[PDB]
Subunit: 458 residues, 4 copies
Amino acid sequence: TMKVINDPIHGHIELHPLLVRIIDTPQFQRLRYIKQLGGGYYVFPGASHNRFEHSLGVGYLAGCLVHALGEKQPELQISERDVLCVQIAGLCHDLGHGPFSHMFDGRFIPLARPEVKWTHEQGSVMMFEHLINSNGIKPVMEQYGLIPEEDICFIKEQIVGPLLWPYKGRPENKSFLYEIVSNKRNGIDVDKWDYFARDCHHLGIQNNFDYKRFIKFARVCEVDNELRICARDKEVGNLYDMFHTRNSLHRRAYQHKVGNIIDTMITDAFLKADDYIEITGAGGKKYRISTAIDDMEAYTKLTDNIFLEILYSTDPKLKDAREILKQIEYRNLFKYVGETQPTGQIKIKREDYESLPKEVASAKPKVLLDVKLKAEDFIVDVINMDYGMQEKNPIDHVSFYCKTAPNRAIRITKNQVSQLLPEKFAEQLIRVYCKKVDRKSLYAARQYFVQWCADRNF
Amino acid sequence: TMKVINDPIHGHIELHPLLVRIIDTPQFQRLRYIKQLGGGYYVFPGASHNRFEHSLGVGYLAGCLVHALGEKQPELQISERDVLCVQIAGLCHDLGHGPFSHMFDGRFIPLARPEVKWTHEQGSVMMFEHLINSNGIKPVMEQYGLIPEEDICFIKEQIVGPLLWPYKGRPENKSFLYEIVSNKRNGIDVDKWDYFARDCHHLGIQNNFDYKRFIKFARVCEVDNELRICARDKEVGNLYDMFHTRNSLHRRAYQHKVGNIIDTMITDAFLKADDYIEITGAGGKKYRISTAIDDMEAYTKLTDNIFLEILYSTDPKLKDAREILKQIEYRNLFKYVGETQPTGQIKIKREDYESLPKEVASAKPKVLLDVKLKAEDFIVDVINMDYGMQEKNPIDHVSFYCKTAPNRAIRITKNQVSQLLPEKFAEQLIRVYCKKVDRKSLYAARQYFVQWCADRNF
Amino acid sequence: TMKVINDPIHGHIELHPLLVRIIDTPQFQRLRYIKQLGGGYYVFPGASHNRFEHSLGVGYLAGCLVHALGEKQPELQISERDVLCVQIAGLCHDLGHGPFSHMFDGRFIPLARPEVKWTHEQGSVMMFEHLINSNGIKPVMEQYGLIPEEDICFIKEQIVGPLLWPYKGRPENKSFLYEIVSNKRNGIDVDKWDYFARDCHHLGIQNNFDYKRFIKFARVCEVDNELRICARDKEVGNLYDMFHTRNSLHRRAYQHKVGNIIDTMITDAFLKADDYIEITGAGGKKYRISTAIDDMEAYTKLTDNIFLEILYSTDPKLKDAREILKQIEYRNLFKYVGETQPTGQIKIKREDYESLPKEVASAKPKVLLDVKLKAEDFIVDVINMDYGMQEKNPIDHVSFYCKTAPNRAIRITKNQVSQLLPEKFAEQLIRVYCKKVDRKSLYAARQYFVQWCADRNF
Amino acid sequence: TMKVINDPIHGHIELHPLLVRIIDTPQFQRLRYIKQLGGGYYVFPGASHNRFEHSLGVGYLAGCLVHALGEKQPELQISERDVLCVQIAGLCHDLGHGPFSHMFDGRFIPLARPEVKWTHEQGSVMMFEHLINSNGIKPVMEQYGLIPEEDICFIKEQIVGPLLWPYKGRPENKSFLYEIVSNKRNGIDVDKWDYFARDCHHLGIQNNFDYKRFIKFARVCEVDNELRICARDKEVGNLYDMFHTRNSLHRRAYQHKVGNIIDTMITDAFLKADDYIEITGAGGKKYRISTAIDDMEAYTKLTDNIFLEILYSTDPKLKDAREILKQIEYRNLFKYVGETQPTGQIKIKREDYESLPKEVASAKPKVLLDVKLKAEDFIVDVINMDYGMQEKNPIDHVSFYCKTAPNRAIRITKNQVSQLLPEKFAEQLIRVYCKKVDRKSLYAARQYFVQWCADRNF
Ligand SMILES: Nc1nc2c(ncn2[C@@H]2O[C@H](COP(=O)(O)OP(=O)(O)OP(=O)(O)O)[C@@H](O)[C@H]2O)c(=O)[nH]1
Ligand SMILES: Nc1nc2c(ncn2[C@@H]2O[C@H](COP(=O)(O)OP(=O)(O)OP(=O)(O)O)[C@@H](O)[C@H]2O)c(=O)[nH]1
Ligand SMILES: Nc1nc2c(ncn2[C@@H]2O[C@H](COP(=O)(O)OP(=O)(O)OP(=O)(O)O)[C@@H](O)[C@H]2O)c(=O)[nH]1
Ligand SMILES: Nc1nc2c(ncn2[C@@H]2O[C@H](COP(=O)(O)OP(=O)(O)OP(=O)(O)O)[C@@H](O)[C@H]2O)c(=O)[nH]1
Ligand SMILES: Nc1ncnc2c1ncn2[C@H]1C[C@H](O)[C@@H](COP(=O)(O)OP(=O)(O)OP(=O)(O)O)O1
Ligand SMILES: Nc1ncnc2c1ncn2[C@H]1C[C@H](O)[C@@H](COP(=O)(O)OP(=O)(O)OP(=O)(O)O)O1
Ligand SMILES: Nc1ccn([C@H]2C[C@H](O)[C@@H](COP(=O)(O)OP(=O)(O)OP(=O)(O)O)O2)c(=O)n1
């Protein structure tokens, strides 16, 4: 029967029985042990939430948006099958996160296995197939009027994108159903609204966006030659404010210096613990931490528990990882030497990060200081802040309609809106750290840094 | 004794007995009948608050800031006399608003009496003198250790400014006390924090600024041979976000189209009712609505009650004002024809607003439309949005200090901060309204407007 | 077309065009100038709200409850005509309040005109007819599918009750529609939920009831022989907590001593100003403040403006009322002598309040004190606190259903629930004041009170 | 130097450097991995917080209360040494919690080791001693003006109580310092305020108590012959409301049926996993889960990680514990048969819970049903709800003072307050569960229960 669950952000959420069936599996319950912000919990003590309630909220908001669209415009022909499919896609959009969320697929996997390209959405697709095939959900889907052959492909396409009309789950007269959970065109979707609200509730920061007002004024118009979701022409300021809010959140919380350095130390400890911790998969077959993304049964057992397993270990071979984690526990962190002024002109590419410590080390300080450092004594971290679409104005890809003619989409240029808006939509900065605590090493490193920054006009 | 009052924004506020004595007078209790937002109550039904609680909050916040400064730096030598003076100045800073707050001294007085310059701060000073002299507060001030001949001048200077060191209330080693209640240099003071919080609580909009964090990191440094209040060097993003929040508040609430047109109609009704209403002042002498700012006893009786006095009147001579107010009550409003694109290059000055309707009327619509309008059928409203300091970057006038050297003040340039900040700090737009609203005077008026906006490159 | 309004309590509210038509009338806009809590604004400075937004909220909540009931049980056959009628009844349920809300019909009218029985619900019915007949809403109702002959009677019966099945607006198979806006059986309705939320938002007190959870578990069952709204059998603790919250609100805010004494003084001033202020009605016919409840046109002009009209008056004959109001403005209040212990055994009726002062005055204090007071120097106020149904357990009149059998209603006895619940549901206490401020009069009155409270076992 | 932490409940908290030193130890950082509500996270998905932030909040509130007391009464002679000692005692009051907080010392230890009497406060004392002696904090305490010989005893006495005047940390003229963190007389202390606010913030339930108002009106008086903390005589209703709030919280969240049954299953799994898991302590000696409370080094490594260590295990001997945990993960829980009506007359003692299943099983249902159950097929849970002092009115042990004479403490009886207060302060109920999911076993168990509940007048 129908079930109810109490959320501190959205209130009482109502769950269809098929969703209840999907939620009560080990593959979904694994998310109770993966934290939303990873290493930000060691700076903001209120951020102890996990991916489980975030996924519930995303599913609920997707259902709400589809219901509002269907009520407002009966000619779109939204059925309940589509509502269930969209809700399921919103529920399982993040099944593929690893320990400490973004740490795993942002810092560890690239360093541990540089020859593969892996993102947590591909893992989400893999884990969704594993869940469905392992927990016998196929007849249950058949029981409520779904056609699995089509609906599973539709859900997969909603989660990861196409696997002229490139999609296969739904025909070209249902294009607006692909913008609800994940919007790869302009980046407006219920996922952002959810984590905005939740991280602002937990971190203790105040929020700006009102997504209920946005849902009130949302409509489906025939843009170009395919149906899309359009906003009222007077919501442009609110859209710009939403993107400003996202930028402020990133700057204040998700790119904190100490949180990033703690993530760096955790990644280093996990790199040292690799080749010594073991995970068992399908058929009594053994796997590594880095190679566990090849077998889903072994991946099902990879959570934040590895941190405490390493910390409380006694094996002689995990000594160095234990040392790094104990260093974290005493608050003996790598220190901060200095940052670089933001600049959108000169760009450091993804293949060039492995040389920056060498550049910093191989400088010639003008003053005479004895203590000299090596290239292994520096960590360089580079932060990219934009509006989500690689220095393109995302509002340029949004359609609007006027009250007089609600069935006609139009475009709004930035100059028409205001003159106090930002002029560019991306930048980059560089941070330098030192792994020596001596009161003289922090002076030598700063002298080294003021000679490498004032060398290339950074 | 000591008294307590419960505030929905700040909680329980504690009041010194002298403040209690000052609050219990007719001149101060007059603020219970003046609304904070004037005509915004007819768009946002939650904004029914008055100036009384706003003044209480401003006084409380000024006390808190002074207390924190004194606690953190014992060498500044803040006495309790200074705390009481600052609290009193914060309490009585808005004694001078007339009916509907900003409408009175923004729209009515300039139109009713163009030969005088009057602001509500001068009225606040006049009313403060009237209150003190009329309610016998001089011995009471003497009773608690104040020296009225000095402290009254100090309070007046805090409220309105100077009446090289130009001030007289305090010597040059107490300069930081003149920017707590009103900051005429960079515009950072507890008044903004208070009305931010209160308007966001009542209107139903969400807030961003954390003034408690700002108070935590505030310090007094010697900036260029003069003591000032300095922020920590890492609060620059928060300051920029605060100014963005102020701009968003103005745009969303304080310059709403319908609220502005309602204010226009109220001002018109008040202009028509002038020369027919009587206010009695000192000595039994009579006064107008416009000339009541010359006698404080007559001004003490000028509140929002004039609206209902005109609406419920029966005298034959107030018929036109009654008609306009009844028009408001049925929601028969002047309609909106069109706005002008923002531009910070070409500026319309204060003396040029009386000719714009003539320009709009005297156009040559290319298309053939019969209905022709006159210069009395148009209302033109001009809106100036900036960062509070006439297109000067207010952050350029803020001092910062570093953690390593907290006694040295420095400057921070915009480029050092980020690249996504705004490039200019002011703009201007023009709104045109129609006063016929029938069926086709709007089509004709829209043609007139499109043929007038293309005649000057607007 | 459809309109939207932003509420700080419920968010964005959506209004049917007929409701918009009804709202834009003088009779409805009169509520913008009547305060919700009357004299509580002079103790709690945050309570400045009026009846306008409360009526909007009540209408919105009634619509929500009807919509949920219709969605959950398609067999009840709720039409959109019923939804509109219920929303209209919820919108206009308080059209009949006078100045300062409950003061007018609780203290003033009984004292001014003791020979009539008048409540603000009868006034609401009268004003609803005045509005409908005066603003030409009958064809507009006919335009949207309503049948005025039936629907107006239905709305009246919802507002005031019957004018075995005693009702006429709807047949006996629609009984559950008569307990949505006003519940005369157990006192559970959206009006309480609305004013709970609004007064807790404004006063700065915390709320506990969750009406959304209640709406989730609400159902319609056949209890005796007629349809009724039933709660889930596990919501009994929440119902008891709701009644505890209502009692706490009354005690903490609505029966504050200073607020009640301020209301007493306002009533006395209005009694003295009667026979000197005049109101014009239909046909150029003159009326008093007390006799204005006989002509709705004259009543339309009776708001809180009379307070400021008396305060700012100059006529010689209103001198005493002016004196009392000026006394309020300086905070020279009647003083508090003492209360009586609550007692639910000996009851004072409404006919003995006029004689209680004589009983208090005609006592003989044992000890010797020279200062002797009269019967005109005392005010006695009698406060009744119950659970809304005259010492009857309101939960005894609620039906519940079990999850296993949702179509059968049952009863739940108090002993089955808990042992920490209250044993009786009503009580009464008595307060005594003094209109003398002398430091000796407050001692003489206290002796008189201790010699009168020990004379009847109080 | 001074450090700041951002709390979602209290805002920005300042920490003295010695507190920062104490916080950065493994023994204190262990609390990041122990959940506040244990098994309530599987019913309320928002309750994912740990003991770390709760301890921070308790320390902050204790500091605030001491500061206010010292500020409004300079004659008490509170020094900064006392403030630091009280803050430290408030910080470390819960160092001794085991996995899943109250489950460990409420259900597991009594069943695992009935021969010992162990509470988490004794563990807190032991762990505080271990922390101080192991992390070299003694010279650091000496550095800031503390005398360890006296101050450590004072802190220990604050945490656990005495180890006429029975105390040793402070003399009899500082008695009011022993009821700030833990109040063993009437149960009013900052710990309750903290967990009230935090659990209401996370669970999604609303709160009633205002501790800031309580702090405003708090004072120190000499009640019998020792200094105590007294409330203003008009805060009695607020105190009663606070205890009602605590009761409501317990009923609604802390004694949820499904949460309690999940705790039962976790305890059973941990009992089966005992004698198979090992923990290493001081000297390389090995310990069990139940015997780890004898060595603090081994206890430092006992957190919620054991749950996931058992769940992800592969050893053959942990099969049954793995089965129970996997059962939890699929939501195949023990079922609820029925409860018993509350009755505070015949109490079931602590030693009598081991035979209740036998009593339930050894009944003779009147009607005929074939399926027969055993005494091992039933779990009986007994719940005690009171006001924290074993059916004694806690308000009877509170002192109050009047405004006229603030230095005299008085008593207030319940009859003087109101008649709607509860008459008894304790009760007891019994819940029965079945471990046989079926369609006939759940009927047989109910038939057995309605014959055992009617055999003793329950
Ligand atoms: N099924 C399920 N419920 C959850 C979960 N997390 C929180 N809950 C809530 O916890 C409550 C406990 O109910 P159930 O787990 O279904 O136990 P029950 O209600 O006794 O079992 P039923 O006979 O199915 O009603 C539910 O109403 C949910 O709202 C979860 O992960 N799975
Ligand atoms: N004096 C005063 N109090 C106000 C005002 N507005 C709200 N209040 C609050 O209302 C409460 C009522 O108290 P008082 O007006 O002083 O009446 P009282 O307490 O019986 O008189 P006292 O003998 O002075 O204590 C106060 O505690 C204030 O916190 C105001 O404008 N003036
Ligand atoms: N009609 C009306 N709107 C109100 C009232 N109070 C607040 N509002 C809000 O104020 C907003 C102003 O809109 P309108 O008064 O209709 O003015 P308008 O939108 O320019 O006129 P339209 O052409 O009808 O759209 C509305 O959207 C309402 O949500 C009220 O009392 N009456
Ligand atoms: N020390 C410490 N800080 C914490 C902890 N949890 C959250 N924080 C916050 O995280 C912030 C990070 O600061 P630090 O850990 O001291 O790092 P840092 O500021 O670069 O080092 P310092 O040179 O001492 O200033 C602090 O300001 C704290 O407010 C904790 O457990 N220990
Ligand atoms: N229970 C309450 N919760 C919150 N605010 C309250 C409560 N009771 C009163 N207030 C408000 C009323 C005023 O705004 C402010 C203080 O008033 P209050 O405590 O009633 O003082 P008072 O002047 O009536 O009493 P007294 O002079 O006897 O101390 O707090
Ligand atoms: N940005 C905003 N955020 C929150 N509430 C807002 C905002 N802008 C307006 N409101 C309020 C004002 C009204 O109370 C309600 C709807 O008003 P609004 O959207 O401005 O309609 P309108 O009548 O001015 O426009 P139109 O007729 O062109 O649709 O919402
Ligand atoms: N550098 C980053 C990136 C994000 N986050 C956290 C903050 C958000 O709460 C969450 C974002 O959730 P997702 O894993 O779904 O990332 P998305 O790709 O969906 O984010 P976006 O909306 O930008 O696409 O991750 C973080 O800690 N640090």
